[PDB]
Amino acid sequence: DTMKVINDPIHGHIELHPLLVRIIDTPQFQRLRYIKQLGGGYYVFPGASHNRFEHSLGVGYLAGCLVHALGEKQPELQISERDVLCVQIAGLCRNLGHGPFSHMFDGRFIPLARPEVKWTHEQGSVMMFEHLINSNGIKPVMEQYGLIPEEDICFIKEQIVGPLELWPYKGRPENKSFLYEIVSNKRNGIDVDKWDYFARDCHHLGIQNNFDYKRFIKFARVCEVDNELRICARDKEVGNLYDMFHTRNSLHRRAYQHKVGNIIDTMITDAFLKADDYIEITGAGGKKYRISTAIDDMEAYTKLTDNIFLEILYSTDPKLKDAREILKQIEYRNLFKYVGETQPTGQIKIKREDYESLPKEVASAKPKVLLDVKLKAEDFIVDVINMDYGMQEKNPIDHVSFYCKTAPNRAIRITKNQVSQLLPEKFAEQLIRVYCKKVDRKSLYAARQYFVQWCADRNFTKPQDGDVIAPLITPQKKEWN
Amino acid sequence: DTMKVINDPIHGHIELHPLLVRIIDTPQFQRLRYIKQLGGGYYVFPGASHNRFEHSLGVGYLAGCLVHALGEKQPELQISERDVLCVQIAGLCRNLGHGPFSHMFDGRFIPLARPEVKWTHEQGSVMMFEHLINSNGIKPVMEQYGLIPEEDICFIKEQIVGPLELWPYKGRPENKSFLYEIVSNKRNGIDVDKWDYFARDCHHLGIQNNFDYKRFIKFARVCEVDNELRICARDKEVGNLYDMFHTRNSLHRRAYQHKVGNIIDTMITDAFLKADDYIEITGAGGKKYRISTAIDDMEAYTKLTDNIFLEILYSTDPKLKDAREILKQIEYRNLFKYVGETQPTGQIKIKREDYESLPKEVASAKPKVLLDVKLKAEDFIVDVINMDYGMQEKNPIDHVSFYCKTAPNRAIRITKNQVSQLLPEKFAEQLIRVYCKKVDRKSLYAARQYFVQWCADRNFTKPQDGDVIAPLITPQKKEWN
Amino acid sequence: DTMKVINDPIHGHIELHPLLVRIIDTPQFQRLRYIKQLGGGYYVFPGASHNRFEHSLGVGYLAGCLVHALGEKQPELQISERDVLCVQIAGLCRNLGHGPFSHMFDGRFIPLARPEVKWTHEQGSVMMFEHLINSNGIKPVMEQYGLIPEEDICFIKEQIVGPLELWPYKGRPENKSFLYEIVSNKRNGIDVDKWDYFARDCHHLGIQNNFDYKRFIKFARVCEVDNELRICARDKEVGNLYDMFHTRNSLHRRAYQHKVGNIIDTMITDAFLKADDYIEITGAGGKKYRISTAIDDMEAYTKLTDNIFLEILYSTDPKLKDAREILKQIEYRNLFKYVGETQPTGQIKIKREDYESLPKEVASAKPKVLLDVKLKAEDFIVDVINMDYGMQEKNPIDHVSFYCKTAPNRAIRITKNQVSQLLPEKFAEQLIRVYCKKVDRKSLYAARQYFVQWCADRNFTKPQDGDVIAPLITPQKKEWN
Amino acid sequence: DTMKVINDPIHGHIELHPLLVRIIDTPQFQRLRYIKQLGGGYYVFPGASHNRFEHSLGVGYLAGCLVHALGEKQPELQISERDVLCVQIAGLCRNLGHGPFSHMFDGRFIPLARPEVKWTHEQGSVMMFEHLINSNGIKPVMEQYGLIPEEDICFIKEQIVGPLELWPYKGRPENKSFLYEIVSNKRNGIDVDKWDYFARDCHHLGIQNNFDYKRFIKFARVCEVDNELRICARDKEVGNLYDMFHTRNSLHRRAYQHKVGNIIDTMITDAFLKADDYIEITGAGGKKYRISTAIDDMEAYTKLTDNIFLEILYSTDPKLKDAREILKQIEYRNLFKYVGETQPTGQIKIKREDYESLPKEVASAKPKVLLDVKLKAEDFIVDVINMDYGMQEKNPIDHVSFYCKTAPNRAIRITKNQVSQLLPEKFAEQLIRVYCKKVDRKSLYAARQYFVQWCADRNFTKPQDGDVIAPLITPQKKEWN
Ligand SMILES: Nc1ncnc2c1ncn2[C@H]1C[C@H](O)[C@@H](COP(=O)(O)OP(=O)(O)OP(=O)(O)O)O1
Numbered sequence A, B, C, D: 001d002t003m004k005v006i007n008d009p010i011h012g013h014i015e016l017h018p019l020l021v022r023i024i025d026t027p028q029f030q031r032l033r034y035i036k037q038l039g040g041g042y043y044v045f046p047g048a049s050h051n052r053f054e055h056s057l058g059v060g061y062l063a064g065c066l067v068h069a070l071g072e073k074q075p076e077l078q079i080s081e082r083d084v085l086c087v088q089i090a091g092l093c094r095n096l097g098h099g100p101f102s103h104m105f106d107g108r109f110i111p112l113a114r115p116e117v118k119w120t121h122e123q124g125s126v127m128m129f130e131h132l133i134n135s136n137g138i139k140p141v142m143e144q145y146g147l148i149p150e151e152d153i154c155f156i157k158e159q160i161v162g163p164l165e166l167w168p169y170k171g172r173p174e175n176k177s178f179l180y181e182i183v184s185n186k187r188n189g190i191d192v193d194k195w196d197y198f199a200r201d202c203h204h205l206g207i208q209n210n211f212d213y214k215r216f217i218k219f220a221r222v223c224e225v226d227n228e229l230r231i232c233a234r235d236k237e238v239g240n241l242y243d244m245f246h247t248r249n250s251l252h253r254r255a256y257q258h259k260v261g262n263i264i265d266t267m268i269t270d271a272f273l274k275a276d277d278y279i280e281i282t283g284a285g286g287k288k289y290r291i292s293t294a295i296d297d298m299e300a301y302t303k304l305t306d307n308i309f310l311e312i313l314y315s316t317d318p319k320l321k322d323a324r325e326i327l328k329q330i331e332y333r334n335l336f337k338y339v340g341e342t343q344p345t346g347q348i349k350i351k352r353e354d355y356e357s358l359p360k361e362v363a364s365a366k367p368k369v370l371l372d373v374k375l376k377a378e379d380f381i382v383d384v385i386n387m388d389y390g391m392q393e394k395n396p397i398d399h400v401s402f403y404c405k406t407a408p409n410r411a412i413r414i415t416k417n418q419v420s421q422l423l424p425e426k427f428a429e430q431l432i433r434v435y436c437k438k439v440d441r442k443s444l445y446a447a448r449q450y451f452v453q454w455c456a457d458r459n460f461t462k463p464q465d466g467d468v469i470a471p472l473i474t475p476q477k478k479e480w481n
């Protein structure tokens, strides 16, 4: 067979190798046509209808482009068509593990439905890749095009999820180390997945992005670092890398962590939780699985898509009413109402174990105002969001290697003070959002007082609309002045 | 009640009136989030993931733009905010009647499922609009914002479907006739819907459009024509208008009538015909409807979306196997194979009543060549496509009124000979595409000989790859050399 | 040393070879920064400030892209780095011959200043290329990077103007004929220069471009045709090629032949004509040249740019008053007034030998209207414009070779009846624009009556606003009624 | 006299009022077609060919847009056609005072040619506005359209340059204070000029901008502050505002302060300095001026554009040799060579005067390494660049008024800790770039040793390629390991 050409609005005409086509034309991959990239963001940004499928295509194409560029600039690295096909495949397949509504599923649902297990979309991706390989007879096709299934499949999996366990990888030796920072870079977070979602998400949201990945590619080289071969970026591009991480953060604050989009994620998740017992998904040899257990059999997970949302919505079965009314309340646009936003202070970090107590703290309060309605802990929703640069408290650029024009083979490091004084002093922070499930005017007035007083009692940041929603409470805190 | 801001990637930030917001936040409208704009096009153009929802938002915005501009340039027309709201609503609601996969439903499925009925997505839009209004108590909100729920609802329905029924309209008098040319122009085909889908479809498909609607709005005026006040375009813009229809014709040949997209639409349609009997949709008071009858109950139709595709695909019920396997053959990318394209010659035109008798002609052929297989009528698929400028054999520009710079109130006509000699001399044509349901190396050869000999015997145009795929048949037709 | 990366808004980051950098950094090439692409178009389309310099970079980049793509898809053609460099240089240098305001210089000025010579910007490009090579010591630099100046310079010049003379080219043998179809296609007109100016001009004008050159490149092959190797496009792309020429025609009708832009070009040409005697340019060895004679000495021509305009405008010499006053009339926006447009009918074609006699025909007209003022031939300007598809009366795609999917090396022809019946049946046409040098309302009124009466007497088409600007004249014409 | 429509690639079709057309069509305004926006930036970014003319149009359009939007949301403000026209004119005319190559003229040339005057394009715009008004008889035209010349012209000037001296303005009273915040905002720097050049510069440079001015406009209100009516932004948009100032800071580091572009600015300034005495420009009543003194007569300044560059490059007079030979090394691309970049720490700030003592310091260093050549202060160029957020050391966001959704009429303040912890803690910084005038390999090597030794001796940051370009010098400073 020959190569297929496909037109992507982001990257233009991309060439696809017959093996990649053979991987694409399977139920396991086509499953991604039915999973939205941004999940509930589509209920806020009407343009964001894009799915994981096209994003996967773009990641594969970009992986191929970067590996090919590095290959043509430096032939001494001995990159083969085999390495290219493999990295392209890893790129194509690192999104196979996503559940319905993407990050809502593994970031919100699974932790609440099955709090005893440890699940990540990466692991879902490796399992679904294995299932994909075996159920469709791919191995002989791999062999036809020059791959060695045992070494190569391993290399692909390690590319997607990291080591499956001194040099920890089995798929490629150290002098091809640079094959491992491309599809999913565990060292600093700079990888082609980000590059594709920057361009796609922006193309669809109606926000435009200032990061030029093609430029970074033009300036990328392979360097010798601590006796291994790593990707080196030209020194003069360090600023751009900072901006790359600034851009990411921006995309989170206007779009990915939008208050309403997130509360819609919470509502869909609660609906799914109240539908978890009554929905049956058919898995291996007829055996029956549930939404929360589908992650344990890939034949079941395969049939787990965004469609579940609609299954609940068009359902007539009375055991599903409680969830169905929630999903109907999304259609009528009767959402939980947003109360406000604040931040922790000092060295205070809201740890995961206390996310469960917070609505009670909010419901306690010491307000001192006409208390015409009482709110109980259940009436409050508290969302804690962690905003970082990809490596928690650390600075990712301290983990990137550079080269200069006078010596393009001398890898060097670059520190923050060498760049600018206008950069951040921190690289992680927490945001706290509070919502009230009671939408009436009196419940809102009250919820605001409870909220602000709660913020005062915890020595948190003063709400931006503090003087507004709580005029009688704000002069309680002397340092908010 | 206040105003909502929406970010659309095509139009930017759009302001939505509380009354419009109220209509949008209903299941009848939100239903459109689950119906893809281009249907089977997403299986060819991976960017085309957009749905009818955002498209509707966009039509609604543009109608308002045009009527508002007309209102500001010529205060003498005394257009009121009420007229504006009615036109905006008409804009929002002219797409409500679409079935699963849009044009596949009313253009392929319904005519084969119900050849006795006359059904259009327009009438469906009217019905679903009535249902939307009634089920959500919109009339009092309409009165609240200054509308007359009797005159106005009528006006909106007439805007979507035309006359119900000199002056055939009842919603607005002759002296506001131009308000009937904005949302759906039955006179010449120039309306805001085309303008939105040009820009949106082009934005997502990855092909770009050369038509500037903002310019057209700037140059649009209301003039008196045959005792009515109609929208007139500036004379020097006639060239642009011809180009507009050329653009429409381009988008069809590249995307909307793509051979593979059309064969996927046909395969899904076939699946739906083979699943129609065994799938029941819950309608009024609990009564059950089938896909082909859902168009007769609006609360049932409400639940008829693309989701139906996945339900069939995830079914375990054996009565759906024959339907379920075809869609599975779409996942594996084992589609009906394209044999070719040809055109009739002289002035013979294929009517709908012969679309059913046509594959028999192709199989009844008597090709003089060493073959290997005999094929039967059931093995061929013949798709007839009508490409026109919107009004069949007519030239739509002969139905546009123009004005000149020196006398901006005097409407004039412009004939084709006054514009260019490089324009088309015909405005309708038929394309015939032939596919074979047998995909083997030898059945394709035969199907090709049948096809070409059929083209010769009916005196059609010679297929572009005629001499290569059927070297032994082409010299029989002297008229191709 | 090594290669330079340059950022272009149209093509992104492009790599430049040291030899190309060396060619670019000369006064002969840098001269193109001071010559506007669209000349007088910038006085109508304020975005069109782009010059010939960047356009040249883009042509070189696209030439290199196409030749590299052909090289990678088909190694059997034996394309070398040397062929690539030569095609890139030819691309970079085919615009070197342009005069001030580009086509105004070669299309309007020179024919009036020196009507005895036959001059084109191509020959100018070859001459300026010879001068560039000799004056900057490029030959030894050419030799260093693996070029053979004797063959190679010839190859480049032939690439720009064709043969300087049974294979007529000496720079490359027949098995490399396809290399002559890239930079300047004398056969059918499909070349990279058009591809760059579509995208650039559209990017700057505020018009959108509907041609995808990257797609065309992806589908380009080298095929065998009549004992030669030609560039061939896939059969399925014939429509896109027609649309390309329609696009070109649209860009001409909207921008390049804009009535006002053309009248500004004409006024500047008059300026240069009335300044020709009084402006002296120092050329080779001190000899002094005039604007109209600079084209015969390249050291003078190097110095011939748009700057001249300003030199005339800032002049204090009373001998330059006549020109300086016309340029000031360009600044105050007192332009010749546009009267109207008409075109011939039947079989009438206006030859160039008759362009001087036309305003006299116009003043010789006898409109039956009471005129307070009489206008003489001196007051009229008549501009005849030839609109074609590049090859006069022929259809250029009758001269492109195609290939089919089943046999990618077998070239075929495709006729117009095989594509569509909605295409043009003619490929050339003439437009006639008439302007009046007298700007007052009464002279305009008069000029219009003269014009329309002339159109009637010559049996031309009726002006679009005929009935409005000449109400008393149009009902005389039997075929306009 | 009617309304004129103009096509701008950034803003689309823009409407220009007959009075605005009359202002635009003057030599004083049209001069801006011949002054590059980014100056020597065009010699690095081949796309940056745009002039200040098409930027001025855009500023006027944006001014009109913002004031009209504010007028439409809040009719209580009593905005008149007169206020809108004045704001538009102010927009159109705030760039009139720009010299050859824009900022290069006022930021580099005048202080070196004439260090005794205080000259800025701000005052120049006012002066040139007066000259335009008087020399072209605009005042009666202003009256024709309903303006009062005496207050209104004052208003316009005060909008461009600020107060011409408790309420300090005379052109408009206290209840219209917000009209002074549109065209040039002296309080915080958020104004429409930035908005136009962000989009334009990005459109042409080949970089994309992530700031959405249309959104800001949609969310802008007039709130009451300290007895003024000021522009208020919605609170939750504060993040975007920070980004705005970040994008600007980005645009400076990538384009406006590009290392090569600045040295090209410096060289052109050098040519002009060595040419100032020998170039004479004709001003008022025949009196003759020099490049540096033309700013003292506006009809002379009128004729002062980028053209002088060419006037110099094209000179044969031996008095111009020193200036003409430098512009020639720009064409040949033999520029001053870049050696490096560094920054001070703590509280050391490079004062404006000591900019002269710096070339002495760099050469005064004593690196103990084999140096083939000794360099003197004249061989060095040291350029100090100030990077800030617009108000030196302060945070402009502490000077913005915000409002809340629940009470849209009371302005509130927002501190940095209320937004995020990921922002800069300083808002101004200095960059130091050092270049060498001798381009040979050894003089360059030496210059590097000198430079790094100077950086070490002054306790500055380590040059990014420090360990590479000067290996024998960096290991001495322990704070660089
Ligand atoms: N005229 C067009 N312009 C731009 N893109 C197109 C056009 N036609 C199709 N596309 C898109 C759709 C696909 O994503 C991609 C490939 O389309 P296409 O060339 O028709 O492949 P194909 O498989 O249908 O034809 P074939 O199998 O005969 O080679 O480009």
Ligand SMILES: Nc1ncnc2c1ncn2[C@H]1C[C@H](O)[C@@H](COP(=O)(O)OP(=O)(O)OP(=O)(O)O)O1
Residues within 6 Å of the ligand: A044, A045, A046, A206, A207, A254, A255, A258, A260, B005, B006, B007, B008, D212, D215, D240, D405
């Ligand atoms: N920073 C942003 N930039 C661009 N678009 C945005 C941004 N934030 C949100 N949007 C989009 C998402 C929506 O389509 C639309 C509405 O945004 P937004 O103002 O946040 O609505 P909202 O309803 O959540 O605010 P609120 O109810 O408080 O007034 O604009």
Ligand SMILES: Nc1ncnc2c1ncn2[C@H]1C[C@H](O)[C@@H](COP(=O)(O)OP(=O)(O)OP(=O)(O)O)O1
Residues within 6 Å of the ligand: A212, A215, A236, A240, A405, C005, C006, C007, C008, D044, D045, D046, D206, D207, D253, D254, D255, D258, D259, D260
């Ligand atoms: N940060 C940037 N982002 C996008 N484009 C840039 C950026 N910086 C410069 N450019 C543009 C300007 C040029 O046209 C092109 C390359 O410039 P640049 O990379 O700075 O080369 P350079 O010659 O100035 O440095 P060097 O010689 O050290 O490589 O890209």
Ligand SMILES: Nc1ncnc2c1ncn2[C@H]1C[C@H](O)[C@@H](COP(=O)(O)OP(=O)(O)OP(=O)(O)O)O1
Residues within 6 Å of the ligand: B212, B215, B236, B240, B405, C044, C045, C046, C206, C207, C254, C255, C260, D005, D006, D007, D008
């Ligand atoms: N077909 C077009 N599409 C897009 N832009 C155009 C087109 N034609 C002209 N333009 C541009 C050029 C101008 O900047 C702006 C307006 O031009 P235009 O409408 O042709 O003015 P005009 O000179 O014809 O006015 P008038 O009606 O008095 O003749 O739009």
Ligand SMILES: [Mg+2]
Residues within 6 Å of the ligand: A004, A005
């Ligand atoms: Mg194919």
Ligand SMILES: [Mg+2]
Residues within 6 Å of the ligand: none
């Ligand atoms: Mg809201």
Ligand SMILES: [Mg+2]
Residues within 6 Å of the ligand: C004
């Ligand atoms: Mg460089």
Ligand SMILES: [Mg+2]
Residues within 6 Å of the ligand: none
């Ligand atoms: Mg005009």
